């Protein structure tokens, strides 16, 4: 079908490598988390590889995984 290369499709452009899009963009983002023991929701990096805590908690709520990071038993969102 007649595709113009100057106004491409976002879904097919995202499948690509991040440097080889038309206009280079990032892959990471930020997301909210809800604590088991407290009410507030904190904002965390999608690829966190440094310790992340729970404001009261001296335990860690995040685990490095080489890519996107895991979190020790909290309940998430996206925004």
């Amino acid at each position: 079908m007649n595709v113009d290369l100057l106004y491409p499709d976002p879904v097919e452009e995202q499948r690509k490598h991040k440097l080889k899009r038309l206009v280079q963009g990032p892959n990471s983002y930020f997301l909210e988390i809800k604590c088991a023991g407290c009410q507030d929701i904190v904002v965390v990096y999608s690829h966190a590889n440094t310790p992340v805590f729970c404001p009261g908690c001296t335990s860690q709520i995040s685990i490095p995984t080489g890519g996107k990071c895991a979190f020790t038993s909290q309940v998430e969102r996206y925004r």
């Binding site: 113009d4 290369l5 100057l6 038309l22 206009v23 280079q24």
Partner: protein, 129 residues
């Protein structure tokens, strides 16, 4: 490391046309390539192009219409007196009737016909026909 972003642009375009593509993307851009595509355009060998921005060295998207036998660059940019243009014409162009050698001069980027209309000289960049 990359040296001649214009050399790479022109090779990409001639490959794409040889296949029979409608568009082609060349990166990076620069002032000289914008000048060269503009001369190509007003001579009437290509359609639209658009320079798309990324707060960096940009990209260019070029539209092709199947007219361009060849395009290339002359490295290094040798210096030319006003009376050697024809000894370069009968060397690079297929005929004395069509084709273009491209000069950079203190009165603009222009083709050979103008460079003689003003009987001045310069340093040669490329050719196309």
């Amino acid at each position: 490391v990359r040296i001649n972003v214009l050399r790479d642009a022109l090779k990409s375009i001639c490959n794409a046309q040889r296949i029979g593509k409608k568009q082609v993307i060349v990166r990076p851009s620069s002032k000289v390539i914008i000048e060269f595509l503009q001369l190509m355009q007003k001579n009437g060998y290509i359609s639209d192009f658009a320079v798309v921005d990324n707060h960096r060295s940009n990209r260019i998207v070029v539209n092709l219409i199947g007219r361009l036998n060849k395009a290339g660059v002359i490295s290094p940019r040798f210096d030319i007196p006003a009376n050697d243009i024809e000894k370069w014409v009968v060397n690079l162009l297929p005929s004395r009737l069509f084709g273009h050698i491209i000069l950079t001069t203190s009165q603009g980027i222009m083709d050979h016909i103008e460079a003689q209309h003003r009987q001045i000289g310069g340093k040669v960049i490329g050719y196309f026909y």
